[PDB]
Scaffold this motif. Structure first.
Motif, short mmCIF file in Angstrom:
data_model
loop_
_atom_site.label_atom_id
_atom_site.label_comp_id
_atom_site.label_asym_id
_atom_site.label_seq_id
_atom_site.Cartn_x
_atom_site.Cartn_y
_atom_site.Cartn_z
N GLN A 7 -58.10 88.88 65.33
CA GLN A 7 -58.28 87.68 64.53
C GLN A 7 -59.30 86.68 65.07
OE1 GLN A 7 -56.24 89.41 61.87
NE2 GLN A 7 -56.70 87.24 61.53
N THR A 8 -59.41 86.51 66.40
CA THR A 8 -60.37 85.56 67.00
C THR A 8 -61.11 86.29 68.06
OG1 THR A 8 -58.56 84.88 68.40
CG2 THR A 8 -59.08 83.46 66.64
N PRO A 9 -61.93 87.23 67.66
CA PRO A 9 -62.70 88.10 68.55
C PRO A 9 -63.69 87.41 69.55
CG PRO A 9 -63.38 88.48 66.23
CD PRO A 9 -62.28 87.42 66.21
N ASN A 10 -64.36 86.34 69.12
CA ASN A 10 -65.30 85.65 69.99
C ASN A 10 -64.58 84.89 71.13
OD1 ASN A 10 -67.72 86.61 68.66
ND2 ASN A 10 -67.72 84.87 67.29
N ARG A 11 -63.49 84.25 70.77
CA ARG A 11 -62.75 83.56 71.72
C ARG A 11 -62.05 84.53 72.65
NH1 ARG A 11 -58.54 78.98 71.20
NH2 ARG A 11 -57.80 78.65 73.32
N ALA A 12 -61.38 85.55 72.11
CA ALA A 12 -60.74 86.58 72.88
C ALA A 12 -61.73 87.29 73.85
CB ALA A 12 -60.09 87.66 71.99
CL LIG Z 1 -63.19 83.61 67.67
#
Ligand SMILES: [Cl-]
Ligand SMILES: [Cl-]
Length: 162
Positions: free
Chosen positions: A141-146
């Protein structure tokens, strides 16, 4: 770089009630207000958290004050959690920041559930844990942050944030 700065980069800052990535009412620096679909409910929680009639808008200082409580709370939650504590204690300063970030975002219960990766982090098996951490809803769901948090675990440096 430090925990406050890291999280400020990840959540941003808004002085007006907004909706998070999951559609929840939030404000300031990633401060979840309610999971209820109602703006009124959100508003009332806000007033209660700040201690004044806010009408959905807070000042910078107010956002910062909620942020300090939230970071403090996350650290303490880790320290009190029987599954998290051992992990945090085994880690270096940078990686400690990575685990605190995840807790701020997904709660203690959420993180405590990553059983396998937690054990891997404890054994200092960096590459393996990171791979395991990626197989999750969180990463999807939040790939950049993860990716940022995950690199931090892998490397032990603040590069993903520099
Ligand atoms: Cl993200
Ligand atoms: Cl609160």
């Amino acid at each position: 770089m430090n925990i406050f700065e890291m999280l400020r980069i990840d959540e941003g800052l808004r002085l007006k009630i907004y909706k998070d990535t999951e559609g929840y009412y939030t404000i300031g620096i990633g401060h979840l207000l309610t999971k209820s679909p109602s703006l009124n409910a959100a508003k009332s929680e806000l007033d209660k958290a700040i201690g004044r009639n806010t009408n959905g808008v807070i000042t910078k200082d107010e956002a910062e004050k909620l942020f300090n409580q939230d970071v403090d709370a996350a650290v303490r939650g880790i320290l009190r959690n029987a599954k998290l504590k051992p992990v945090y204690d085994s880690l270096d300063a940078v990686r400690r920041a990575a685990l605190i970030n995840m807790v701020f975002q997904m709660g203690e219960t959420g993180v405590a559930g990553f059983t396998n990766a937690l054990r891997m982090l404890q054994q200092k098996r960096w590459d393996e844990a990171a791979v395991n951490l990626a197989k999750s809803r969180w990463y999807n769901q939040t790939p950049n942050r993860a990716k940022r948090v995950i690199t931090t675990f892998r490397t032990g440096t603040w590069d993903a944030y520099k």
